[PDB]
Amino acid sequence: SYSRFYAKPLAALVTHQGREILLHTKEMVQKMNLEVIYGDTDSIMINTNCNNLEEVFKLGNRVKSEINKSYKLLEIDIDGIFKSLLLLKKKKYAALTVEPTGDGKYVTKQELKGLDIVRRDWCELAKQAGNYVISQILSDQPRDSIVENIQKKLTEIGENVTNGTVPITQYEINKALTKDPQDYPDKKSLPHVHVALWINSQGGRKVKAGDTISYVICQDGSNLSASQRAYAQEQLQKQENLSIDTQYYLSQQVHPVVARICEPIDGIDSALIAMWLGLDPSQFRDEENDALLGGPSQLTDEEKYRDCERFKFFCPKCGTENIYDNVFDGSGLQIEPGLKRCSKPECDASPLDYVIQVHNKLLLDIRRYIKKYYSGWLVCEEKTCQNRTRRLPLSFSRNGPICQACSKATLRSEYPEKALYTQLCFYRFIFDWDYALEKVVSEQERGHLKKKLFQESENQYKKLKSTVDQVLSRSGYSEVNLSKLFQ
């Protein structure tokens, strides 16, 4: 825009043509049984799927020819070759750069871009684990061997930690104090600030800004967050009531550093890494593939609402919680609407009697979810940062807000609009009599439910669904303005 010759029409036309060329190139490369694993106006990263460098050069020449055929003046060059590539983002990868020495022989050199960890408060255990994982990935071995070696090392580290064979110096975490410890607004959640306050309280050399605090997270029988259970090493050696919190050191130190490099491998997830380390996977559980498997619009009800909270209602009479996740409960002729009988067999109270209370609880839950959405909590997508802030910064990358803790990753909403929309849709679903009858219910069950003795329940369910429908009618996520699209 600042250009002396700025011409918005010309720039728009050039950009549009560039888009067309890029998409056509993707189609061509795909037709050649190869994969375009990245593409930008400046470069294209293609998966040759070959183990020979000569065939790689042949495929590059063929791709250049195919592109030039449709665009004569578009001259392309090969900028590099990678033997192996772990890719998380352009500017975020590990690779074995190939320099060909001639005559079919080449030399490989490791190249890590964007894998440095901004946070420096990491125990040597996690650093060594990450180094080993990167060494295994950047070896010329196949995928299966790499995964087997990674599993071996992770199980070994977990067993060593749980057996207390790990040198204590490797549990130490060093963090720099950028302020006076009392001046941190989040001092409660910060362990190094806790240790600095303790050090100052002792009466020795007071720790001011610029000082490095070394601490180890220890279990002391306090039922307090890991931040509060942060102790200096000497205190751990002296008290005799302090033990290293191995679970913390495996879940919060090793697991992130390892999963930030291993999760991209297909077949490995955070849960698998947790299992290998010896933790509980329960605590750790692409649009193209989704389209290839049905897309977001053709999901089953169970998969569409699997992350949504179910409707909890406490019986006024007995006080037992009732979880509602469907309009109907039971099978066969024993099937009845969920709000007909209490979940406690000894309780004869019918929740359908207290439908005013159900309405009020529904409104309170809707308010709770709307408040959660408008809280605007953002979390850094980087595993090694996981910065949580309410403040949205005006500094944006192409992908969204830039995290101001590490300055290298995007902030993602903790409770996005889709989450709230799906929650409201689920609350509508658990009260949709007609939909349940048509889709969820079977034939004999449908016949048993499509008679009298349930008309009153049907009317009450319709009234309850009216509330969620009213709320959804006021949501901008559930409406598409076709005027704005087509003009």
Partner: protein, 431 residues
Amino acid sequence: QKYGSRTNRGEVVTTYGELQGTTWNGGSGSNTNVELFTSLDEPLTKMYKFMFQKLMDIREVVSIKIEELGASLKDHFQIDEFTSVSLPAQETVTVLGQIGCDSNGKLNSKSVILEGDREHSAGMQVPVDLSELKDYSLFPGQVVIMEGTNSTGRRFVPTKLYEGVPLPFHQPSKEFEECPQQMVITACGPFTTSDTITYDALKDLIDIVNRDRPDICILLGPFLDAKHEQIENLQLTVTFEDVFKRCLKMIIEGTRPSGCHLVIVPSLRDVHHDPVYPQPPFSCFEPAKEDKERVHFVADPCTLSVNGVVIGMTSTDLLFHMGAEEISSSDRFSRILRHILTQRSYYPLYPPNEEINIDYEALYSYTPMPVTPDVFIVPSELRYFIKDVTGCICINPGRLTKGLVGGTYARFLVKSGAMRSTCISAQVVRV
């Protein structure tokens, strides 16, 4: 029990302005003209679709807020050029930005950051060192202009903090020159005791209204509090809408003898209404044909014109929200009120408090203060007061009910063109 046996009924707990008799009387809304302040921007009068905020839209709204306020201040101060906040500065430069906290806790003098706008700084932030600033008063989300230096390129050191510039007051037309002084009774929720749902304080206030016959009665929410112990634990045998309808019927029908224009302002604590700010007006009640011209369902915030007198009002507890975050070098409420007036927004705090849901497009469209109001009603959990901030009479009438005990309301007299003494008298009185 405790409320019904109180002994300080009718006590004047605070006074301001011309002394008046022990009894106040009004015109019963006879020669009264109440409307919404006709400014350039259209008012919020109907529900707007919400629950769909794009982070890009929030970024744009915040950036344009900073840019617009900075443009007005630059014209006012004859500032030559703004400089990018992030760039190093060996010599003194003027920088426009908004204040924030480097962490999630409460702001302190060592955790201040300045975030620039997209036009001059590409949205970049910079830490701020307040060691060389002799006097300051900063809260998060405050748009400021500062002269300072950044020698290390990593820490901005302000040397001057430009003062705020409030909007000009309203210049009333002569159409209301001959109108008499108008009486306004303002009360804020909760209206029922913590352990009851009978609205006894509301009945007492309605009796007071019929007794004194004010010209306007401004009732601010909540009317069915979400924090009421009965509401949270689900002990109510009737729907929320039914209770609210009963309350509104009580208010409207009970004020029939007084003939007083009722201005109803919703609250974020209204369990029956849409939880979003700016809050749209109530729309679940249809007044009878004999009360249509008397009842005004307005939005939160609201700028009302009463015979030329501009009254700003908000149900949101602005003072409590900003007192928890304002940092000063050395009256705190007066400082916060001046901050609100100078920022020219009914909610300048960013990020907001944990108890308010903000739709930022609606905030941009419906929270700008058109002018500096003659009277500014700001109910708060803090103590009641009547303050004069830069010529604006800021009234905190407290809340009608304070837990188990009765609370307070306020009554004031407004006349356009009086003496700038548009507020003849004001009093915080007990219920």
